[PDB]
């Protein structure tokens, strides 16, 4: 608390906090310089790919979607997310990408600017057969987390088997000639490949049972894939508790 001296304070910080924001920014901007505008410096963390699903999880979903077949409003929440993802793989959207078949990895070259947008493989929603959506016995959609320059697999395709032992359910898979087709990899990155589409795998649980919580875990297997669950339950697997309480 002074007087006719506050000007000696205000002006001080003005060009001291000034100098400091100026240095702080100074050091962010140098750091930023030393990173590739197409690939992060560390991939470890991300390394085991996560498996995520469309149905917004109330808790541990992907199908921890408890709803009532008898009620229209009950499913509507899950449908919004379901439509949101699928909307992306519309045919209108894909004009210019390239058509493929289930096969081996395709190498666009190095992660370099000298080539134009790397052409991604087309993916038709049509491949996901039979899947508003399933009013009863939901048809959840699975996806593998994108990771640049990662080649998951061996053989033609990386499998996804969902399992409960464990009470009855009937598993049905819709996956574009397979499971996850290898022709989709490696992923060049958003910079290199803009409207890139990752392979989806629809799963339908036609299960005869009703009114009970079924813990259904869908797992992906590969040399590359590893699982935790002692931590991230997401790591290469799903945790969904479907309940068709009708």
């Amino acid at each position: 608390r002074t007087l006719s001296r506050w000007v000696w304070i205000s002006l001080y910080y003005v060009a001291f906090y000034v100098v400091m924001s100026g240095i702080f920014a100074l050091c962010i901007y140098v750091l930023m310089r030393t990173i590739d505008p197409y690939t992060p410096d560390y991939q470890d963390q991300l390394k085991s790919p996560g498996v995520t699903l469309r149905p917004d999880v109330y808790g541990e979903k992907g199908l921890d979607i408890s709803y009532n077949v008898s009620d229209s409003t009950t499913w509507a929440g899950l449908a919004h997310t379901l439509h949101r993802f699928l909307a992306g793989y519309s045919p209108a959207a894909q004009e210019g990408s390239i058509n493929c078949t289930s096969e081996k990895y395709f190498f666009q070259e190095s992660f370099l600017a000298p080539n134009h947008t790397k052409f991604s493989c087309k993916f038709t929603a049509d491949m996901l057969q039979n899947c508003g959506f399933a009013e009863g016995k939901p048809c959840f959609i699975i996806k593998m987390n994108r990771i640049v320059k990662f080649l998951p697999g061996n053989s033609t395709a990386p499998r996804v088997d969902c399992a409960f032992d464990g009470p009855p359910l009937q598993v049905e898979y819709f996956p574009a000639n397979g499971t996850y087709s290898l022709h989709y990899f490696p992923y060049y990155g958003k910079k290199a490949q803009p409207h890139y589409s990752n392979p989806l795998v629809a799963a339908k649980l036609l299960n005869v049972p009703r009114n009970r919580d079924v813990v259904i875990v869908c797992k992906i297997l590969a040399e590359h894939v590893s699982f935790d669950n002692p931590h991230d339950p997401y790591e290469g697997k799903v945790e969904f508790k479907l309940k068709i309480q009708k």
Binding site: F24, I28, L31, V148, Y234, E235
Partner: protein, 993 residues
């Protein structure tokens, strides 16, 4: 009120014996009736002292829990439970953070409570020590018969009898006495026996012979008296109540602590609420709004700080312990370093309290002996034959003898059986002459006349050692005047000569001068009896004057003395350089008091009192303007008349003051008067008469060896060695602690900003949380502790003793300049360094800084396993969290790294690290090594990511804050360079802690 107790007492010593009885309804001969005594007992109450009420420890501990910071910590702890409670009901949250964090925070408050409790200690058993004095019972005469009764049973009016070896049961009016002497050291602090008789000697009852007081004891003789006062009513009983009555008070250091707590608490509440509302406007749910708040509280309160202060004090205390200075109360460690005025007792404090010879008058010259214990002085005279003659009388004419087994100890130290005068003489000769016993052996004493009350002289006849004429030599000593009447000739040099008027006049001058010195003077003379007149057989009659007493030869005069402790004069000057005013307050007589004052330096050379001006000018005292005299000597009798306003004037008016012949209450009054001025006062004393003053003083310091038990109980600190120099050390230590405390406080506070800012950005930016709550505790509780403590070790930057005492009003432990530097300048730099590493970790992982804004809702969403980074990769919930936690860990480490520079800068307020040497402090360096070791251990050790959420950091990560750490060092170095370069103001006033 105690105010009544502060005043001088009034008594019945003036009344006649018979009149005294009328008031009391008592009998001088018969004493009270059994029935009457009982009746009075119920009326008056018991002859006992009743201590006051105290407080429990449980309450004392709990009171600390409400130490601001503790309050904030409590709100945080509860708020944690509140969030937890809301959570448990609404959605089953498996997490245990809140609940646990709540547990941890509560623990922090309790542990912190212990530290403050430890600091706040008051070990006081004053009443207990007094109880130790109490005897048992007392003899009274009732129904014409004497019987022993419980002392409490004693009532006013009964007839009491005392004899040597008994403690006075109550205040008594002496009716009759025979050779009674008493020790009134309780009132005076002086042990010399004082005679007690029925006659009223003086108007002041404290001085008169006819009154005997409770708390004193009869040394010899017997006496009877009528009890005037009992219990609390007695003169000392009141002093007891007053000492008990006076409040302990609050240490200055304590006041400073509370002051900053309010400052920090204020900022905490302001930012806490300020952001609470800012969040709500943002649209944050109450569930979240509270969580942010808890973080804010943790960030703002320096959890570790109060404990650090206690540790720093304890460490300082330990050093002093090595000094032979024991500190009972941890806070007292500072007080001293804040004293403005010292009120000191003379005897046993300033002085050694050991009588001794002063000077001698022979050969028409005054010679001065060496009074000092160690005998640091020089010799006055070996050569003159006159000296040998005087020496012989001092040895021969002396009854005193050393206790056996003394040979180990030094001559002035050894215990002697005899009166003080004879012991002084014995020690005087033994030192210069060699063994006295030898002299007594060589000259056997045939006959002697011991000092008589009437005679006023002591005479001895010895066989001359000389073999040529082993005849009889007569020696005698006594009152100087009396000896003079007895002498015809004077041994001048070796030869004797007639005693002319001229020499006689010189004798008077010598006698008056020595007396002026406040010294007790004795005359010495001898006579060589004629051989023909006295045969070797010749019998001498002690009872009847068998031999001539007159026409003797006057050898010389001897006078006595005592002395200041060796360290004292130097210590006084040092206190004065420090700007501390030193006042003498003593029970002793003024002539002695003034002389020592000059010796020690209380009264500087050239300074004059009104009386001395009058003498020099040879003008009346009334004529002298008092303003002219800087120095003053006030007798207790005069003090009694004066009002406190008058006392105030004396204190303001004089720089060098001596209060002599003061009573215990008057010492208290002097102390209070100084305090009234607004000065912090220290009292130094050894005696029971010091007790009230010691209690009242802001800090009382008692002498350990010399000190009486009561004084020690009254005091805050004890000098075990009786080393007065320790006071100078004590004052320096408190100041150093204040200087070092500021450094430690600034150091601790600076880290608050890097803790605060991440929370703020979190809300405004909507970025992932840069630093967690748990992480904050790792800093304040873990890493910062050793380094903060190490600042206590710092040496003085400048000559601390050179500066004046701090102005408790003006100079505070924590001021706005500290906040500006800690919060505004350096802490800000640290915050950025923390953020930078935060950005680096995220960016390396794939989340570039641009992308982070407004991400937190998605980031926090447990449901979303697929958050997209800058690259286009998708992350699960747990995976991103690991990165986030790693961010917390690096941010944490960045604080440590930035703290390294801060520790170095905090080392010195003014001076450069080059000058001070950022290096001598071993503890400080240890702090840097341990703090880094702990941080690495926390990050690297397996299992820590679970509990603390600390993750392993890449080598590169450690480096991120390095540039910021360096900037801090340079910045502070440049700043300080400016301060020293120009003492003018700008940088100094603003930043200088």
């Amino acid at each position: 009120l105690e105010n009544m107790k502060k005043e001088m007492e009034i008594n019945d010593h003036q009344l006649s014996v018979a009149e005294l009885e009328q008031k009391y309804q008592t009998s001088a001969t018969k004493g009270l009736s059994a029935s009457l005594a009982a009746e009075l007992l119920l009326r008056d109450g018991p002859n006992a002292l009743r201590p006051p009420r105290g407080t429990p420890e449980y309450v004392k501990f709990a009171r600390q829990l409400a130490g601001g910071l503790q309050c904030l910590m409590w709100v945080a702890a509860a708020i944690c439970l509140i969030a937890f409670a809301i959570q448990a009901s609404e959605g089953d949250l498996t997490t245990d953070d809140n609940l646990y964090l709540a547990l941890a925070l509560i623990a922090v408050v309790v542990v912190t409570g212990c530290f403050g409790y430890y600091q706040e200690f008051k070990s006081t058993n004053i009443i207990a020590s007094f109880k130790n004095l109490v005897p048992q019972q007392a003899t009274v005469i009732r129904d014409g018969d004497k019987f022993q009764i419980n002392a409490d049973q004693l009532v006013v009016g009964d007839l009491v009898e005392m004899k040597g070896g008994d403690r006075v049961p109550a205040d008594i009016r002496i009716l009759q006495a025979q050779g009674r002497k008493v020790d009134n050291s309780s009132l005076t602090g002086e042990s010399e026996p004082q005679t007690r008789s029925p006659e009223c000697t003086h108007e002041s009852p404290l001085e008169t012979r006819n009154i005997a007081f409770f708390s004193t004891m009869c040394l010899e003789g017997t006496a009877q008296g009528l009890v005037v006062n009992t219990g609390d009513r007695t003169i000392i009983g009141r002093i007891a109540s007053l000492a008990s009555g006076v409040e302990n008070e609050k240490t200055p250091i304590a006041i400073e602590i509370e002051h900053f707590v309010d400052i920090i608490a204020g900022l905490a509440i302001l930012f806490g609420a300020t952001f609470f509302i800012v969040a709500m406007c943002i649209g944050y749910t109450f569930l979240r709004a509270m969580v942010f708040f808890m973080a804010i509280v943790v960030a703002y309160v320096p959890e570790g700080l109060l404990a650090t202060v206690t540790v720093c004090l304890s460490l300082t205390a330990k050093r002093l312990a090595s000094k032979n200075c024991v500190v009972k109360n941890l806070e007292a460690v500072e007080t001293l370093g804040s004293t403005s005025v010292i009120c000191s007792d003379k005897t046993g404090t300033l002085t050694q309290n050991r009588m001794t010879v002063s000077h001698l008058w022979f050969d028409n010259h005054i010679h001065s002996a060496d009074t000092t214990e160690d005998q640091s002085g020089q010799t006055f005279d070996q050569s003159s034959e006159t000296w040998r003659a005087l020496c012989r009388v001092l040895t021969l004419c002396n009854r005193a003898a050393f206790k056996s087994g003394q040979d180990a100890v030094p001559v002035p130290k050894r215990i002697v059986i005899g009166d003080a005068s004879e012991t002084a003489l014995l020690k005087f000769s033994e030192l210069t002459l060699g063994n006295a016993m030898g002299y007594r052996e060589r000259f056997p004493k045939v006959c002697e006349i011991p000092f008589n009350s009437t005679n006023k002289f002591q005479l001895s006849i010895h066989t001359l050692e000389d073999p040529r004429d082993p005849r009889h030599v007569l020696v005698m000593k006594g009152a100087p005047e009396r000896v003079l009447e007895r002498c015809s000739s004077i041994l001048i040099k070796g030869q004797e000569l007639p005693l002319d008027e001229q020499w006689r006049e010189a004798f008077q001058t010598a006698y008056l001068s020595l007396g002026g010195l406040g010294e007790r003077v004795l005359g010495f003379c001898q006579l060589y009896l004629s051989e023909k007149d006295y045969p070797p057989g010749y019998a001498f009659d002690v009872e009847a004057m068998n031999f001539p007493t007159s026409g003797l030869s006057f050898a010389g005069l001897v006078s006595m003395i005592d002395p200041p402790r060796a360290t004292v004069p130097d210590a006084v000057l040092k206190c004065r350089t420090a700007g501390i005013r030193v006042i003498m307050v003593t029970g002793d007589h003024p002539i002695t008091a003034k002389a020592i004052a000059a010796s020690v330096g209380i009264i500087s050379e050239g300074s004059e009192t009104v009386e001395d001006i009058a003498a020099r000018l040879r003008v009346p005292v009334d004529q002298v303007n008092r303003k002219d005299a800087r120095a003053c000597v006030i007798n207790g009798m005069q003090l009694k008349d004066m009002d406190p306003s008058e006392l105030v004037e004396a204190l303001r008016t004089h720089p060098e003051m001596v209060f002599a012949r003061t009573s215990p209450q008057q010492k208290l009054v002097i102390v209070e008067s100084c305090q009234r001025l607004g000065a912090i006062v220290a009292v130094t004393g050894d005696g029971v008469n010091d007790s009230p003053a010691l209690k009242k003083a802001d800090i009382g310091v008692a002498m350990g060896i010399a000190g009486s038990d009561a004084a020690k109980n009254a005091a805050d600190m004890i000098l075990l060695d009786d080393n007065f120099a320790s006071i100078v050390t004590g004052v320096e230590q408190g100041r150093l602690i204040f200087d070092n405390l500021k450094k430690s406080i600034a150091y601790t506070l600076t880290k608050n900003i890097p803790e605060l800012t991440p929370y703020l950005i979190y809300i405004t930016v909507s970025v992932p949380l840069p630093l967690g709550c748990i992480t904050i505790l790792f800093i304040e509780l873990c890493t910062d502790i050793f380094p903060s403590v190490s600042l206590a070790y710092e040496k003085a930057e400048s000559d601390i003793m050179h500066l004046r005492p701090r102005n408790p009003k003006r100079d505070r432990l924590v001021n706005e300049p500290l906040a500006a530097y800690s919060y505004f300048q350096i802490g800000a730099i640290q915050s950025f360094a923390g953020f930078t590493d935060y950005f680096t970790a995220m960016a390396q992982e794939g989340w570039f800084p641009l992308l982070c804004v407004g991400l937190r809702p998605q980031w926090e969403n447990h449901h979303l396993q697929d958050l997209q980074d800058s690259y286009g990769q998708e992350w699960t919930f747990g995976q991103r969290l690991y990165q986030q936690y790693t961010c917390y860990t690096v941010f944490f480490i960045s604080i440590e790294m930035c703290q390294i520079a801060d520790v170095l800068i905090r080392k010195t307020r003014r001076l450069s690290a080059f000058q001070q040497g950022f290096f001598r402090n071993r503890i400080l360096v240890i702090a840097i090594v341990f703090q880094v070791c702990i941080g690495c251990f926390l990050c690297y050790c397996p299992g820590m990511p679970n509990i603390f959420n600390f993750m392993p950091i890449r080598f590169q990560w450690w480096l991120v804050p390095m540039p910021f750490g360096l900037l801090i060092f340079v910045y502070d170095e440049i700043r300080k360079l400016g301060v020293r370069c120009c003492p003018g103001s700008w940088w100094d006033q603003e930043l200088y802690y």
